[PDB]
Design a protein around this nucleic acid. Structure first.
Lengths: 750, 50
RNA sequence: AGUAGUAACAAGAG
RNA sequence: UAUACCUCUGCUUCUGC
């Protein structure tokens, strides 16, 4: 029998040419089940495992167990090391300022000038943020609002001024307050008249209560990080833990990251913050120069590299030193501003997730053990794995159920600034005037080091120096994952090179499906993904035409909107079949109304509604595009054009599409789980703000388009406008004498 | 019995394809196998729970 | 049982 | 206790840069 082997393609086609077939992206990505406490505690232990030979002291502020590796004894083994020497960083930073003249003071200026212009609402555009008040993750926009309302009680109205600087000035001051009060809504019963047997009914009204916490508690909550586990993380067997930051720290990170971002843009040997074609364009030229500059009759070697335990080693105290060097020329107020973010990370606290679930198999019972009650149970009932961890956690464990994590960068957030520290290593280029020359690329943890020397024996000795150089910065190169070869082909951030960056279609494959915004939006997105892949990721017209076929399939089944003439049975399909019979111009019907798919390679860039508009019936187009239809709702400038996309590599970046606003451009019902919890009270709180904002937008129509500016009252604005509007309408003669006096009377009360 | 129930239910004149929650269907789907949730206070007091 | 795989679900709540 | 062969829920019992 003829025994097929799939690898045998690699005999004919080389690995890079057909790398797409080494990525299983038609399959399901790994997800996490239950708790992430065992994953977090592991990180907590491993972070201190690499810093255990440093200096251990007790924080006089928090009262926690702190560990300081920086300027510790140098390692005598290949085990991960956070023992980075301050001088060796400062030298590498100096070397960067010499090679790139007056970049630090230039980058500092741009950031400092931006900070002044930066509004407080800049902290709204974020993901799930830790809210210190309720001690749970919530949307950034809410997590911000809860802090502003709480700060108003403790008497800190820097937020009202509009700038982020005075709001940041309030945050560091709020630590000094002896007690921090915050609203905590609590239910109250209230009889209301009704048509009952006993003509009334009880409605549980929310009532805000002033709850206080001590100076220490707030300081810890402000330095606390809430931990989870990384779900949908590709190309990984075992799982790993991640962390979310508070509203306090998030203010100062934005500036320091923006500062490093300004440096990185101008640095040659950085993969960030550039992306897409711009990234390739740079790396191509960099590779061409790093190739063609090499000494003739020598050997150029590319180390396909990667750093293991990136976040677990890198210390905040080194990142603090970096800002102080970068802000040397900048004024003293900005120096102290940039110093806070690292100072907060230097004394950060880790929240250990949910906890551990214990069960009797015979009794068939289960129960979650909260993190504060971890040592309530004798450790004989925990399994070996957890028992060992919990004992190692003990000297870092706090009574409230948190872990003092002074070292490491649990959450990360500093990507741009962590890249720069990597570039600083690539800037050195030589040690002891030896007969080699190294220079590489940096994308946070990911790197690719080029080495030009006499012979390969010299090259490897040159690589050995880079390894030992990186150990003094806190960067541990992965002997396992990292490998070396003669220049011509290499790998850098899932991009494969072979005398030019090769096409890798499998990386972008998951994005081809129904994105799940709505019928009208997903159609545009679907084709825009197909046409953009023909361009960038080399999809031939045959595969491209098939990608259109396979979309309409997934689209028609997902939105249950098969062709009108097709006799596929379904609740919606019943009305679609009538529309097909009623409509004359059936080619004018959209795919979502059981019309035909008319898309091909050429017309991917044109919206479906525009393509068919001329072919539509006069009645149908009226219904489809009814100005006051109930489906669409109050459109936000982002709500129309932009939508989220999650590619398997970098953060969730929102792409923009082109679609016409019609009946199909609808929204889905809110998650109703909230109705059964005590969170109910937020529904009223929302609909209250909703009324105010919706009435403000009725007075100022431009509020929807461009952000309203003003430090004055929101009512004061609405009053003066409606006063003028009434006066001018009267004098013009749109308003009568009956209405004007009534208008001036109502406004008179305000 | 479940296969027979399927072949019978799929062969009948009724519109619905629903299957009665029989002893064999309940076993087959694995009914009420979820471990009963209890308070932390009782669980910490109980020794057999590990 | 089974899914699944370092921990869960195999319904939860009033 | 009881209403409860009733009622509500299906991402909102922690998803970061």
């Amino acid at each position: 029998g003829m025994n097929i082997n799939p690898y045998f393609l690699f005999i004919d086609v080389p690995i890079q040419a057909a790398i797409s077939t080494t990525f299983p992206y038609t399959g399901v990505p790994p997800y996490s089940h239950g708790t992430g406490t065992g994953y977090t505690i592991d990180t907590v232990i491993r972070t201190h495992e690499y810093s255990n030979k440093g200096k251990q002291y007790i924080s006089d502020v928090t009262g926690c167990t702190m560990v300081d590796p920086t300027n510790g004894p140098l390692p005598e083994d290949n085990e991960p090391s956070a023992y980075a020497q301050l001088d060796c960083v400062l030298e590498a930073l100096d070397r960067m300022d010499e090679e790139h003249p007056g970049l630090f003071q230039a980058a500092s200026q741009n950031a400092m000038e931006t900070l002044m212009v930066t509004t407080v609402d800049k902290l709204t555009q974020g993901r799930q943020t830790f809210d210190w008040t309720v001690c749970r993750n919530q949307p950034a926009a809410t997590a911000l609002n809860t802090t502003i309302t709480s700060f108003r009680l403790n008497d800190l109205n820097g937020a009202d001024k509009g700038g982020l600087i005075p709001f940041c000035q309030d945050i560091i001051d709020s630590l000094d307050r002896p007690e921090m009060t915050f609203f905590s809504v609590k239910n109250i019963k209230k009889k209301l008249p009704a048509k009952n047997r006993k003509g009334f009914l009880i409605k549980r009204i929310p009532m805000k209560v002033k709850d206080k916490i001590t100076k220490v508690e707030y300081i810890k909550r402000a330095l606390s990080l809430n931990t989870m586990t990384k779900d949908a993380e590709r190309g990984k067997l075992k799982r790993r833990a991640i962390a979310t930051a508070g509203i306090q720290i998030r203010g100062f990170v934005l500036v320091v990251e923006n500062l490093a971002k300004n440096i990185c843009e101008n640095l040659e040997q950085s993969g960030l913050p550039v992306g897409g074609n711009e990234k390739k364009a740079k790396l191509s030229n960099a590779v061409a120069k790093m190739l063609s500059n090499c000494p003739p009759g020598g050997i150029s070697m590319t180390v396909t590299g990667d750093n293991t335990k990136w976040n677990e080693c890198l210390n905040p105290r080194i990142f603090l030193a970096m800002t102080e060097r970068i802000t040397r020329d900048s004024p003293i107020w900005f120096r102290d501003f940039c110093s806070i973010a690292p100072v907060l990370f230097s004394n950060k606290i880790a929240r250990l997730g949910k906890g551990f679930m214990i069960t009797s198999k015979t009794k068939r019972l289960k129960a979650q053990i909260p993190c504060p009650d971890l040592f309530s149970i004798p450790l004989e009932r925990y399994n070996e794995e957890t028992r060992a961890k919990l004992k190692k956690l003990k000297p870092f464990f706090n009574e409230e159920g948190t872990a003092s994590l002074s070292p490491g960068m649990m959450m990360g957030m500093f990507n741009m600034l962590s890249t720069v520290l990597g570039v600083a290593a690539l800037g050195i280029k030589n040690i002891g005037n030896k007969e080699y020359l190294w220079d590489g690329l940096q994308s946070s943890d990911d790197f690719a080091l080029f080495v030009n020397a006499k012979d390969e024996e010299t090259c490897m000795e040159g690589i050995n120096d880079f390894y030992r150089t990186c150990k003094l910065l806190g960067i541990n190169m992965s002997k396992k994952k990292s490998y070396c070869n003669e220049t011509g082909m290499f790998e850098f951030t899932s991009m494969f090179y072979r005398d030019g960056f090769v096409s890798n279609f499998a990386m972008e494959l998951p994005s081809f499906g129904v994105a799940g915004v709505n019928e009208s939006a997903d159609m545009a997105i679907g084709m825009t993904i197909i046409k953009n892949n023909m361009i960038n990721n080399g999809m031939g017209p045959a595969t491209a035409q098939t990608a259109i076929q396979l979309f309409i399939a997934d689209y028609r089944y997902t939105y249950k909107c098969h062709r009108g003439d097709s006799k596929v049975e379904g609740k919606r399909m019943k009305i679609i079949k009538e529309l097909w019979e009623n409509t004359k111009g059936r080619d004018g019907l959209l795919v979502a109304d059981g019309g035909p798919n008319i898309y091909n390679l050429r017309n991917l860039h044109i919206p479906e509604i525009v393509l068919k508009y001329n072919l539509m019936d006069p009645e149908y187009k009226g219904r489809l595009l009814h100005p006051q239809n109930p489906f669409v709702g109050h459109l936000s400038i982002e709500g129309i054009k932009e939508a989220d996309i999650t590619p398997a590599h970098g953060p969730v970046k929102k792409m923009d599409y082109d679609a016409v606003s019609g009946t199909h451009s609808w929204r889905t019902k809110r998650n109703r789980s909230i109705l059964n919890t005590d969170q109910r009270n937020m529904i009223l709180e929302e609909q209250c703000y909703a009324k105010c904002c919706n009435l403000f937008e009725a007075c100022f129509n431009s509020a929807s388009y461009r952000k309203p500016v003003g430090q004055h009252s929101m009512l004061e604005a609405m009053a003066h406008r409606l006063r003028m509007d009434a006066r001018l309408d009267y004098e013009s003669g749109r308003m009568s004498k009956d209405d004007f006096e009534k208008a001036m009377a109502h406004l008179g009360e305000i | 019995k479940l296969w027979r129930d399927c072949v019978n239910t799929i062969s009948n004149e009724e519109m619905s394809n629903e299957l009665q929650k029989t002893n064999y269907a309940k076993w087959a789907t694995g009914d009420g196998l979820t471990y009963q949730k209890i308070m932390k206070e009782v669980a910490i007091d109980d020794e057999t729970m590990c």
